């Protein structure tokens, strides 16, 4: 129904995991760009991205939203940028930042190497443990955060003392949790197709982490795929 885009997630959407995409593929894209726009979002970076669909990545899709959204980019131009000590405040992030480190030392573990935090644009990955930590370093961990719950205890006491500051916690992985605004996920790329006209904007992805939020977000249309040929039947079968 009348103008509609398509967003897709990049890494196993429209390539096989790991991979750049396909001549077949990219020219079926192309194909299906000539009458109903679209777009691509994910978590990784534009350079990543153009490792994946190529490095003229901004001139084959009408969108494209590397680091979910908070990298946009429409027919060419960078669009703008974001980071979580911009939106949040400085002062906002030491605040985080001196708690996480404070809380941190008062935690004896088997093991401690280093980057016990990390600084992303749109997200702060912590680790009451570090984040070098080695192949076998990371399975111990791992295996006494079993019964322990160690990552889940602190997740849990900064949705305390920070309750209210638009932020929410993620525990994943065996090592590390990932801190972020509220809806710094793939939904934040949404922003930049909500105000083009477009009566339905549809979005192939992965639908569960849990569960992906844009894939369930009002906007979209979800379409989760397994692959990107199934991106294509998918497409074929909806459009064209």
């Known amino acids: 129904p009348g103008p509609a885009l398509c967003l897709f997630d990049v890494d196993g959407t429209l390539t096989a995991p790991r991979q750049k995409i396909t001549k077949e593929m990219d020219d079926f894209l192309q194909k299906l760009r000539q009458k109903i726009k679209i777009g691509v979002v994910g978590g990784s970076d534009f350079e990543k991205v153009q ?21 946009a980019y429409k027919d060419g131009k960078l669009l703008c940028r974001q980071n979580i000590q911009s939106h949040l405040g400085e002062a906002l992030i030491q605040d985080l930042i001196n708690y996480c480190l404070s809380y941190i030392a008062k935690i004896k573990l088997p093991k401690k190497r280093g980057t016990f935090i990390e600084f992303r644009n749109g997200m702060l990955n912590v680790s009451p443990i570090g984040r070098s930590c080695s192949q076998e370093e990371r399975i111990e961990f791992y295996e006494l955060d079993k019964k322990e719950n160690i990552r889940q205890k602190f997740v849990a006491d900064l949705r305390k003392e920070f309750a209210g500051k638009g932020l929410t916690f993620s525990i994943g992985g065996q090592i590390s949790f990932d801190v972020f605004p509220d809806g710094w996920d793939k939904r934040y790329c949404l922003r930049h197709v909500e105000n083009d006209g477009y009566k339905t904007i549809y979005f192939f992805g992965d639908k569960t982490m849990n569960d992906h939020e844009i894939f369930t977000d009002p906007r979209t249309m979800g379409y989760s795929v397994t692959a990107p040929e199934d991106t294509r039947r998918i497409c074929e079968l909806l459009f064209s």
């Open 51 to 71: 490792e994946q669909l190529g490095n003229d990545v901004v001139e084959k899709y009408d969108y494209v939203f590397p680091e979910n959204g908070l990298v």
